[PDB]
Write a protein that binds this ligand. Sequence first.
Ligand SMILES: O=P(O)(O)O[C@H]1O[C@H](CO)[C@@H](O)[C@H](O)[C@H]1O
Ligand SMILES: [Ca+2]
Length: 448
Amino acid sequence: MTLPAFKAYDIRGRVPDELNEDLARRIGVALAAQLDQGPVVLGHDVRLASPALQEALSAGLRASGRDVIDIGLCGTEEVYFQTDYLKAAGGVMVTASHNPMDYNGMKLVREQARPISSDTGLFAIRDTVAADTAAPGEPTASEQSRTDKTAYLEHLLSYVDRSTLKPLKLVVNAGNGGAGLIVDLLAPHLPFEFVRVFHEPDGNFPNGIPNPLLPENRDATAKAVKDNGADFGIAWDGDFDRCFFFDHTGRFIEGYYLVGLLAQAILAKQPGGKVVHDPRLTWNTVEQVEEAGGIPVLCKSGHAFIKEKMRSENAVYGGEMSAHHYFREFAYADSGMIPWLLIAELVSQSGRSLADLVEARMQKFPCSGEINFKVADAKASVARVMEHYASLSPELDYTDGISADFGQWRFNLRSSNTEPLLRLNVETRGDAALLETRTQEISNLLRG
Ligand SMILES: O=P(O)(O)O[C@H]1O[C@H](CO)[C@@H](O)[C@H](O)[C@H]1O
Ligand SMILES: [Ca+2]
């Protein structure tokens, strides 16, 4: 077979049978052979096993003559930022995301933090590692510890005009991941009053593995917002490249609406820019981007496709409905920090609540939310859906699965690249009833 831990976009698997220090060392050796010239940035998340996996990566890299820049315990976006900022040859983030306790993984980038994915180096690394029975060499290069976050923090703060910020009360929920470290470093530079929930990093995860999409985790942020009269709340996943917003009523804001909201925020600073978005949910983004004077650019979902489209378009911002937000000046990479700074600035400057900023958009373009299906035969199920709707002659687009635009409603139906799942998204033109009847109709067909 092949090593299961090597996935489409990253490495992830159970420790130690799918991922271990031996494999991590071999990955470091193989990565050295795939990169252009330069040092390699290494960082890791709060999981208990992550430092030892990083140390093994460093040992293999240095055995291959790569200088290593250890940026320590960090968020995934810090590996991206420092890889680009320090003009490194590449970088690796050791992170398990929201996988179980016995799991870990790696996210790999080359120069300018460009993703390394299955077809752009990751399976080449896998195949090298799979066949590597060489004895480990000894280090011929050095490791340097670079824990200075000054340039990173300055970069984050550059997205807002600090003199215009108001002393909003913000709930922040790190989920015992790593986000609180950065919040606390930003706080002396910000006027906000923070209400800190599950703030301390703890790889034992006493309050659950960080995942704000799970309703019981969602409710912890909502409750803190409501009980403290906070202006809004922010929660992160463990490596905080994803952020999740709760308005002052405690309501979780579906990520679709943040794409248009952030696009308008960015377009105020970079007028006429292009904005990349995915095909799952589109109408609101296209309208908000165009209204703000930007140009929307449709792109298949998946961070590697988004980033490569942003680069070829010089796009100022890209956003996915799945809580991923990419910024041109941030090495075209995603950050879980820039978005809430931008939203705090928008609330401060406009005098409008986060709820108000999105309310009419969510009424105008209601969406189903992403609904996932594990079916016996994905291809046959998609065909049942398309045959059912054939007599209505929808406009079809195959950018990313199937998008079908019926006029007053549309859907996107695609296979996941990271799980053996079918993913459904439906939206309508201001019609909640049509949204529900079509969502249920499609669901019945998929399950038939
Ligand atoms: O499983 P999917 O849907 O192919 O991909 C999922 O993981 C990718 C990497 O995190 C994201 O960029 C996608 O937006 C998300 O939907
Ligand atoms: Ca993450």
